[PDB]
Amino acid sequence: MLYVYMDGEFVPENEAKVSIFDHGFLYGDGVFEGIRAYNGRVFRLKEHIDRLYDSAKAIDLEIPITKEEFMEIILETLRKNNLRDAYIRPIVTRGIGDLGLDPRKCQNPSIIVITKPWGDLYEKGLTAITVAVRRNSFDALPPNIKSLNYLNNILAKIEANAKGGDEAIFLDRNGYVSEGSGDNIFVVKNGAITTPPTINNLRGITREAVIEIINRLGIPFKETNIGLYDLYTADEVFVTGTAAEIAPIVVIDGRKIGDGKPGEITRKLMEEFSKLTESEGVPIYE
Amino acid sequence: MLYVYMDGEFVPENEAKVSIFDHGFLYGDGVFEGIRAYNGRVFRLKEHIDRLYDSAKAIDLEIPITKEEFMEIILETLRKNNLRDAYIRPIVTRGIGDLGLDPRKCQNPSIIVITKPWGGDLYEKGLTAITVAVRRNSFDALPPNIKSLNYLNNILAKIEANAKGGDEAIFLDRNGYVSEGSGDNIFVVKNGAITTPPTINNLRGITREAVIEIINRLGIPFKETNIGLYDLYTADEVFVTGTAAEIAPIVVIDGRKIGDGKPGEITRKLMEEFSKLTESEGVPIYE
Amino acid sequence: MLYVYMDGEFVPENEAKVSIFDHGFLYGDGVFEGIRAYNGRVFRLKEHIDRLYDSAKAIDLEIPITKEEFMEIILETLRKNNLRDAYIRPIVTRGIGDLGLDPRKCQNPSIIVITKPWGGDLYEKGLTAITVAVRRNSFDALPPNIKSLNYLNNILAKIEANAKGGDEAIFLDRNGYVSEGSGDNIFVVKNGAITTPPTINNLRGITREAVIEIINRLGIPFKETNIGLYDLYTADEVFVTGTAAEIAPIVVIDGRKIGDGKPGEITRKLMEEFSKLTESEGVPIYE
Amino acid sequence: MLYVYMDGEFVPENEAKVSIFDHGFLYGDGVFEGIRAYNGRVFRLKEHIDRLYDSAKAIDLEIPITKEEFMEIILETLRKNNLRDAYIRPIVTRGIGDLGLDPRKCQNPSIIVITKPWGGDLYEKGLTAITVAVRRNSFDALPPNIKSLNYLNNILAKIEANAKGGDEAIFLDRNGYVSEGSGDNIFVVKNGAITTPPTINNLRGITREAVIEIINRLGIPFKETNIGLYDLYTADEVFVTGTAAEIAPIVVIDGRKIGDGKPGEITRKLMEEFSKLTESEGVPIYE
Amino acid sequence: MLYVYMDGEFVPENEAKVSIFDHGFLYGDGVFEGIRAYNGRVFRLKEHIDRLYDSAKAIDLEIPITKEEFMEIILETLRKNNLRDAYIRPIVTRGIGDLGLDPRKCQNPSIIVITKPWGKLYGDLYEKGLTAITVAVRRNSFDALPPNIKSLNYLNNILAKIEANAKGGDEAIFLDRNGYVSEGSGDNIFVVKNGAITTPPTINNLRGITREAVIEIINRLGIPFKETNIGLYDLYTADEVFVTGTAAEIAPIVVIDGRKIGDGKPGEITRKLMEEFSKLTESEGVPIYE
Amino acid sequence: MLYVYMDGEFVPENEAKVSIFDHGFLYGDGVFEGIRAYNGRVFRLKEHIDRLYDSAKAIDLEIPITKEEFMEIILETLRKNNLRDAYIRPIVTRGIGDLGLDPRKCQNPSIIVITKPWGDLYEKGLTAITVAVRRNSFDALPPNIKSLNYLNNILAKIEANAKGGDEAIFLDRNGYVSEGSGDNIFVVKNGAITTPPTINNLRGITREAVIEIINRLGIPFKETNIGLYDLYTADEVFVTGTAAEIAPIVVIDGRKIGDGKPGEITRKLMEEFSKLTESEGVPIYE
Ligand SMILES: [Cl-]
Ligand SMILES: [Cl-]
Ligand SMILES: [Cl-]
């Protein structure tokens, strides 16, 4: 029933498989994106594709097709599955080499496009915990690369699962707030909004869209380092990402954030963001 | 011609494939080992299997079979391919789940065993190494003690080495101490004494452990302690250790000749002793 | 019904009060100890008093009496309350001064001795622990070796543990190494060997020292070395040590079962040996 | 003569005492503020009270009264002592609980308000400062943004300054950036522009905020950014800000004259503007 | 043929020598500047002299003459050698003292001015662009040996240069003690991405006079500009990268750690800034002769 | 009339000058040693020469003569000046090159040997202060290299001069005790001695000799990281170096160390070290 684009063919999900000798599998040597289709439009497709190519560049991986070709493949995959509302996961792998680490011995990067249909926690808000693991360092495994190396994020998620949080919050190698395991973080205090610079986290496309809205609404905004203290004493906290959209965080490390309910500024941004997703995007069908 | 063990079946290499929905593929959420078979014996099989289970425990992954069963699967795979001299790569993945990162939605970890025939031009001359700008994954972020499918830190270091004229990359850690090579542990020889970093910022190498046993047996003064760039540059000899590499001499670091620029006497002695050990020890595949 | 020593007078608990202008209250500017009396003997009294004076020296606080006098005051306080089995908390404060933080304006340090009767369930099952996001106070900022009235770092860790389903919090330090629990030192048991962090990033525990003496006496291989999250997660056994806790097994860390998830054999052996030590050693309270 | 508010009653200073079993005393588990009354007005009372509640929130302490009630208690205490010019120190403690550090066993937080009369030589000449070896408490360990009873880090810095010939201590943070003085925020003036550290590694000073408002009103170029030792040493002018200090010029740092070694023109201008602000703003105590 | 100013006298290059007991030699205890003369004008002379005095202040060294006197000595040295296009290296040392490191035993700081003829034999020498590598050594810390001080302690820079020589780069790029991009071994670094320019704050590197001039041009041209921390990722994924310094002017970086930067050629924004900077150096400066 | 060896000639001190174009002067690009002659013997000459060559190797500088030749030049210089009790400062520079920092343009390293005669604070002990500047990092400008880059040490000394200490004590980039501005540090507590590992400081020749004495006397000894706390609460503290020998530290940051007088263990080591210097060394004359 659902087809996956895999190296020039459409393949049913149950048969969508990659060689175990692909370095993307052996070493997580590959890059991916997360993209949303709303009402027959692909939201910020070009921005996501730009980031995919940036991720590839960072790991010295040449994507064997052009950005225009990649965009067409994504639209084609959504068409083949007749989707209007979907989550899209393009993946590019290093390809097959030998059992060592050398990426120069790898031939034929795989191009994969997964599309899955998209059909309670946002009325109540999420509980978050700060994890003991620091975010992968920007001088070790830069988190700005959306790569198949996501075990740092998974360890944080495992901590959150064990420790009663819906979401994990990372600090970075220098003690600053970084992001959630799968999303950027914003703090609201006295009508002003702050978010960490992007060096220690990922340059979120949702984060960028939300900042555009914040500026359009004239809410005072600063991109600056934040600490545990700012999280705990915030009027409101929310996280942003493709899958999450804008998710309110109402408890952090057992402490109620403000009144413990999604805040007024968060709710306003949720509305404005919904509007943006309904009116922007590359059309799938004509 | 070569078969891979994949979840209870032997599958030809060309067909050995994993679902793209396995979290091992999507997120590198899985663990692996590198094991060597020499002359029909599997060198330190039990030690590698112990480490595999430790790696799995560190990432909260339950391996669905026992260690004894895992050892039997490895031996069976070597038998099916009629190998006596091989490299073995067991892999355990988190398994198929949804497209989020939550490992709770994953069911059925995959168990994979790759065996490839493994039959020293760079070892007579020694290797050139470069120190990389990327630090090793932190022991408080993505602990390098876990041999996981997250190897992009190692690959970035290797990319730097390829671009910068080194056969091998050397990492420093988040605190500025020498960690290891991109795929092996590092030892420094100075005035007849040997030092190696503690294992917290690198990986508890099985070769490293075997080499330390030899060092102690030979009565060479040995210390496990932090090392710096200075110690690398001014060493009498440097070598790296791992399953694939065995003992590889490093004769140039960052453009500087190490000692006389040839593999050193202590390194050569350890290479001989290690060869001897691989020829006389191990779990028999056939016998 | 209990008397507290307070600056030369014995005072009922309900009246044991300190001026709000004491810098020990305003700024946590003071030091303390935790000492145990077992069966009419005070366990390691001299070691605790030495550490109290070391803590005071570290914060440039002169304790206005001698160590011998301090020991006599402690024994007297236990006598006055007729205790044989107790927890003792000596406290020395900077003393009353002005509203600024300058300790030079403080005159007369207060000397306080609290003694409370000691009359487990969590020790048969073992404790659950979580690693906290807050790092331990740095050894170059507010050295954790000082047992001072500044315990908010420990309290924040405890608050995290309370919210996150742990009985105990485990700290990492400013450099990413394992430090200690919020109120106790940490030991890791792996393949019959024991490791514990060096004391620089934590506190030189008197229980920790006693336990190391036992470990050496029993010939269990022991190393004082840096430990990481990986070592915690993959340990055969983990336990914590302190005056109040004695030896407490840790059986779950961050949702991961430690070994079999029950107090381990080595831990149980050390618990027995430590019990024996407390029953046979100490400064007698009554003659 | 002077009364202290303590849990619903006015108590003479000499009798203002807290139980030694209060966690605010045992562990510095509590929060405080420093507020100034000028000419019958309380300067920035609401801002200080907001920060007090933020400090409490950061340490998960529930202040048992509302902010309005707290403001009334402060004004009442100033009235009872007939003060027009005073320093006010509200304190909230975790309260009496057990001898362990667990804050869940604490039940009734104490509310304390100290008011002391206020009544220049060092401000005409300026202060000498030294940079200390101790780093500021980390924003990921014991966040300095919390104005808590844990002030030993500040006291250690002050002890260093006392011993090393400075009127004031300057901290760097865990990452090597300038943080603040032991009891005040720091500003640097260079080529007519002013810089101050972001507030993450120090405290969000109410004086600092007021001074930034003045700076902006006067159109002096201003940047909140990280500063280093170099910026201190080569500054045209340096000054510190806090409730007690107001604006204090720093004219020597680590033996080096700052600019001409006298309070600078920009500093003097800000001192005048700040004086004006304190004379015309505030919550009236009486009228 | 070339004279060096040395403590009040002009001395031929071959005889320009300092006592081995000068702490400037023994311990690198001294400060220096790098200044350019273009077409009879000294570019940003006053800015360089201000930085020289700031460097001296940072190491608690009192320069025994005034800034005006120092400027006159520099112009005099250029005059004596009849230069119009030159590189100028003023140096101030702590002076002769005993063999311990205590600077209190030093008396009489030396003042040295070197001037060497400089200038392009070929206009487009940066037509292809430079290759760079990121080094393993971190930049001297701003809490250890602050890189803002242009001192005679340049071994950190030399180690990075040694790494670059061995590793196939024309230039070395440093990260700092906290993992952020700092600068090249002898120049400030700028990154261009989607028409916007970023550069590290100056705390972990040096407040470059070229960097300041380039920022003025960037602002005048209305290119979006931000001073903020940058990482390896930003270098690798940049549209363009360039470095700035007195000797280098504006040098395009077209390869970093084996990765082509954008199209692997000097970029449009870089080329535009190179032109604008050339114009600035042709029309500004303290006249040597006039 | 003291002579300095300079590239093959003995030159009077007042004329001992180096070209300002030598990179050793321009960039501190060179290495040095500090060696002591006692009663006609050069103490640990071979150890110092080994370290000099190690320093040179660390900065990729080829010393143009052999170690045996270097030792002869040192002895010759002491002979020419008729010294029996002296401080020797051999220096090797990168040499003259262009005005850039590239060491490849530098072709002829200078060899310099300074010898100066050596002829109250030890009875009373020294005051020390801990400095704000951290020691040059072992991953930036490794302090194990005894190079002409000594401004880190000088900044610490400037702090000590201004702050009332005879000596400055450094912490390292990771917060551990490193060393004094010109000497290694040892801490004595409950009859046991500790000293930092050598990675963050310099492998002192005096430090090595003192450790040999400590072992010979059977004093418990451990090489391990030390903190501010260990300094402040020590029974005794002392520093070691060629010029200082063994110097007691009796006050640190305003705190009396033990009783505020040189300790028993320190005094014992001072005696044992004196004995060692009187009975060991390469003879200058026959
Ligand atoms: Cl990392
Ligand atoms: Cl801290
Ligand atoms: Cl450094």
CB atoms within 10 A of CB B42: 23
Q: How far is B54 from chain C (nearest CA, A)?
A: 6
Helix then strand then coil, in percent of chain A rounded to 5, is 30, 30, 40
Query: Three-class SS of residue D6?
Result: strand
Which backbone phi and psi does C263 adopt, to 5 degrees? -55, 130
Cα–Cα dist A266/A169, whole Å: 18
SS3 (DSSP) at C102: coil
- Phi, psi at residue A176, to the nearest 5°? -90, 150
Residue F82 token pair: 């008729």
Max CA separation in chain E (angstroms): 57
Chain D within 8 Å of A133 (Cβ-Cβ)?
no
Min distance F207 CA to chain C CA atoms (Å): 22
F231/E58 Cα distance (integer angstroms): 29
Is F17 in contact with E13 (Cβ distance < 8 A)? Answer: no
Label the pairing between strands F126-130 and F167-171: parallel
State the Cα–Cα distance between residues C136 and C174, nearest whole angstrom: 7
| Cβ neighbours for A279, distance < 8 A, ≥ 6 positions apart | none
d(Cα D94, Cα D114) in Å, to the nearest integer? 18
Ligand 2 midpoint to CA D138 (Å)? 4
Q: How near does any CA of chain E get to the CA of B167, in Å? A: 12
CB-based contacts of A38, cutoff 8 Å, min separation 6: A85, A277, A278, A281
Q: Which of C30, C36, C73 is nearest to C55 (CA)?
A: C30
Q: What is the Cα–Cα distance from C89 to C2, expressed in whole angstroms? A: 14
**Residue A176, C-beta contacts closer than 8 angstroms, at least 6 positions apart:** A196, A200, A225, A226, A227, D139, D140, D200
CB B192 within 8 A of CB B218: no
**C162 token code pair:** 């309370």
In C, minimum Cα distance to F253 occurs at C60
Give ranges for CATH 3.30.470.10 in chain D.
1-125
**Which residues precede chain breaks (C–N over 2.5 Å) in chain F?**
119
Q: Are B142 and B160 in contact (CB under 8 A)?
A: no
Structure token digits, residue D56: 């409490």
Given the residues C57, C80, C147, C257, select the one marked as catalytic: C147
Pairing of strands C246-253, C127-131: parallel
* CA proximity to F231, closest of F172, F176, F165, F173: F176
F253 with D160: Cβ contact below 8 A? yes
Q: What is the domain class of F1-124 according to CATH?
A: alpha beta
Which residue from A174, A224, A228 is facing D143, i.e. has the nearest CB?
A228
Return d(Cα D206, Cα D241) in angstroms, integer. Answer: 9
Question: What is the b/e burial string over F206-241, where b = at least 16 CB atoms within 10 angstroms of the residue's CB?
Answer: bbebbbebbeeeeeebeebbbbbbbbbbbbbbbbbb
Contact F137 B176 (CB under 8 A): yes
Question: Rounded distance, CA C172 to CA C144, Å?
Answer: 12
SS (H, E, C) D200-226: HHCCCCHHHHHHHHHHHHCCCCEEECC
Q: What is the DSSP string of chain B?
A: --EEEETTEEEEGGG-EEETTBHHHHS--EEE--EEEETTEEETHHHHHHHHHHHHHHTT---SS-HHHHHHHHHHHHHHTT-SSEEEEEEEE--B--SSS-GGG-B---EEEEEEE----HHHH-EEEEE-SSPP--TTTS-TTS-BS--HHHHHHHHHHHHHT-SEEEEE-TTS-EEEESSSEEEEEETTEEEE--GGGS---HHHHHHHHHHHHTT--EEE----HHHHHT-SEEEEEETTTEEEEEEEETTEEPTTSS--HHHHHHHHHHHHHHHH-SEES--
Contact between B58 and C230 using a beta-carbon 8 Å cutoff: yes
For the domain made up of E1-128, give the CATH fold: D-amino Acid Aminotransferase; Chain A, domain 1 (3.30.470)
Question: CA torsion angle for A141, A142, A144, A150 (degrees, to 10)?
Answer: 20
Q: Which of A175, A176, A229 sits opposite D146 (nearest CB)?
A: A229
User: Cβ of E233 under 8 Å from any chain A Cβ?
Assistant: yes
N- to C-terminal Cα separation, chain C = 24
Q: Which residues of D117-152 are buried (b: 16+ CB within 10 A; e: fewer)?
A: eeeeeebeebbbbbbbbbbbbbbbbbbbbbbbbbbb
Q: Which residues of F touch D255 (CB under 8 A)?
A: 158-159, 161-163
CA distance A16 to chain B (A): 6
Going from the Cα of C138 to the center of ligand 2, the distance in angstroms, rounded, reads 4
What CATH number belongs to D1-125? 3.30.470.10
Q: Which amino acid is at D182?
A: S
Ligand 3 centroid vs A133 CA: distance in angstroms?
26
- Classify strands E171-175 and E181-184 as parallel, antiparallel or unpaired: antiparallel
Question: What distance in Å separates the CA atoms of residue A265 and residue A259, rounded to the nearest whole number?
Answer: 13
Whether D63 contacts D56, CB under 8 Å: yes
CB C255, CB A161: distance < 8 Å: yes
Amino acid at F249: I
Contacts of E165 in chain B (CB under 8 A): 255
Output the CA C147–ligand 1 centroid distance in Å: 32
CA distance B102 to D205: 41
**Geometric angle at alpha carbon D98, from D95 and D99, rounded to 5°:** 110
Distance between CA atoms of residues B168 and B156, nearest Å: 12
Total count of residues recorded for chain A: 286
Report the run of H or E that residue D54 belongs to, with start and end: helix D45-58
Interface touch F159/D229, C-beta < 8 Å: no
Q: Which of B258, B231, B244 is nearest to B128 (CA)?
A: B258
Residue B147 annotated among the catalytic residues of the structure: yes
CATH top-level class of C126-280: alpha beta
Residue F217 DSSP label: T
Task: For chain D, say whether F99 makes contact (Cβ under 8 Å).
Answer: no
Of the candidates B269, B250, B251, which has an alpha carbon nearest to the alpha carbon of residue B260? B251
Are A133 and B140 spatial neighbours (Cβ–Cβ below 8 Å)? Answer: yes
- Kindly determine whether residue E114 and residue F99, on different chains, have CB atoms separated by under 8 Å: yes
Going by C-beta distance under 8 Å and a sequence separation of 6 or more, which residues neighbour residue A104?
A97, B162
Active-site positions of E read 150
User: CB–CB of E35/E246 below 8 Å?
Assistant: yes
Distance CA F116, CA F34 (A): 11
Asked if F134 and E141 count as a contact pair (C-beta separation under 8 A), the reply is yes
Rounded CA-CA distance E264/F97 in Å is 32
Q: Which token pair is A252?
A: 């952090």
Query: Which residue ranges does chain E devote to CATH 3.30.470.10?
Result: 1-128
Burial (CB count <10 Å: 0-12, 13-18, 19+), residue D242 = buried
Which helix (H) or strand (E) is E181 found in, with range?
strand E181-184
All CATH 3.20.10.10 domain ranges in chain E, comma separated: 129-283
Burial pattern E197-224, b for ≥16 Cβ within 10 A else e, equals bbbbbbbbbbbbbbbebbbebbeeeeee
Amino acid, res. D245: A
Q: Which residues of C touch F223 (CB under 8 A)?
A: none
Q: Is A174 helix (H, G, I), strand (E, B) or coil?
A: coil
> In 3-state terms, what secondary structure has residue A48?
helix
Q: Is C143 on the interface with F (CB under 8 A)?
A: yes
Contact B133 E175 (CB under 8 A): yes
Mutation pick from E139, E141, E177, E233 vs chain A, by most beta carbons of A within 10 Å, is E233
Domain A125-279 has CATH 1.20.200.10: no
Contacts of A142 in chain E (CB under 8 A): 231-233
Main-chain dihedrals φ then ψ at residue A276, nearest 5 degrees: -65, -40
Mutate to test the interface with A, among B152, B153, B202 (most CBs of A within 10 A): B152
CA distance E72 to E80: 12
What spacing in Å lies between the alpha carbon of C236 and ligand 1's midpoint?
26
Name the residue among B133, B135, B159 with its Cβ closest to that of E135: B133
Identify the closest residue of chain F to C174 by CA–CA distance. Answer: F174
Per the entry, the structure determination technique was: X-ray
Given C159, C164, C172, which is nearest A164 (Cβ)? C164
* DSSP 8-state class, residue A84: S
The verdict on a CB contact (< 8 Å) between F99 and E112 is no
Q: How far apart are CA E36 and CA E85, in angstroms?
A: 7
**Cβ–Cβ of B255/E165 closer than 8 Å?**
yes
Per CB-CB distance under 8 Å, the chain C contacts of B141 are 176
Number of the ligand closest to the Cα of C173: 2
CATH architecture of E129-283: Alpha-Beta Barrel (3.20)
What CA–CA distance (Å, rounded) separates D6 from D77? Answer: 10
With contact defined as beta carbons under 8 Å apart, do C274 and C211 qualify?
yes
Nearest to E231 among A54, A60, A144 (CB): A144
Give Cα C121 to chain centroid, integer Å: 21
Burial B171-201 (b: 16+ CB within 10 A, else e): bbbbbbbbbbbbbbbbbbbbeeebbbbbbbb
Q: At what angle do helices A45-58 and A205-216 cross, to 10 degrees?
A: 130
First to last CA, chain B: 23
Helix, strand, coil percentages for chain F (3-state, nearest 5) = 30, 30, 40
Q: How far is C38 from chain F (nearest CA, A)?
A: 27
Q: Work out the burial of residue B158: count CB atoms within 10 Å of its CB; fewer than 13 is exposed, 13-18 middle, 19 or more buried.
A: buried
Tell which of A5, A19, A27 to mutate to test the B interface (max B CBs under 10 Å). Answer: A27
**CB of A108 closer than 8 Å to CB of A97:** no
CA dist., res. F68 & res. F90, Å (int): 14
Which run of H or of E encompasses E36? strand E35-38
Which is it for strands C35-38 and C86-93: parallel, antiparallel or unpaired?
antiparallel
Question: Which residue intervals of F59-204 are DSSP H helices?
Answer: 67-80, 121-124, 151-163
Containing H/E element for A80? helix A67-80
Sign of the torsion angle spanned by Cα atoms F125, F127, F129, F134: negative
> What part of D 248-287 touches A (C-beta under 8 Å)?
none
Angle at A173 between CA F168 and CA E134, to 5 degrees: 85
Which candidate, E187, E139, E134, places its Cα nearest to that of E163?
E134
Give the fold, CATH level 3, of B125-280: D-amino Acid Aminotransferase; Chain A, domain 2 (3.20.10)
Of the candidates C211, C264, C213, C256, which has an alpha carbon nearest to the alpha carbon of residue C232? C256
Say if residues D43 and D86 touch (Cβ distance below 8 Å): no
Q: Tell me the angle at which helices F264-279 and F205-216 cross, rounded to the nearest 10 degrees.
A: 110
Residue F97 has which token pair? 């090159």
Chain D: residue whose CA lies nearest to C24: D25
- Cβ count near F2 (within 10 Å): 18
* A59:B155 CB<8 A: yes
User: Ligand 3 centroid to E145 CA: how many Å?
Assistant: 6
What is the gyration radius of the CA atoms in chain C, in angstroms?
19
Q: Counting ligands in written order, which one lies closest to the CA of residue E159?
A: 3
Classify A252 as helix, strand or coil: strand
CB distance A125 to A262 below 8 Å: yes
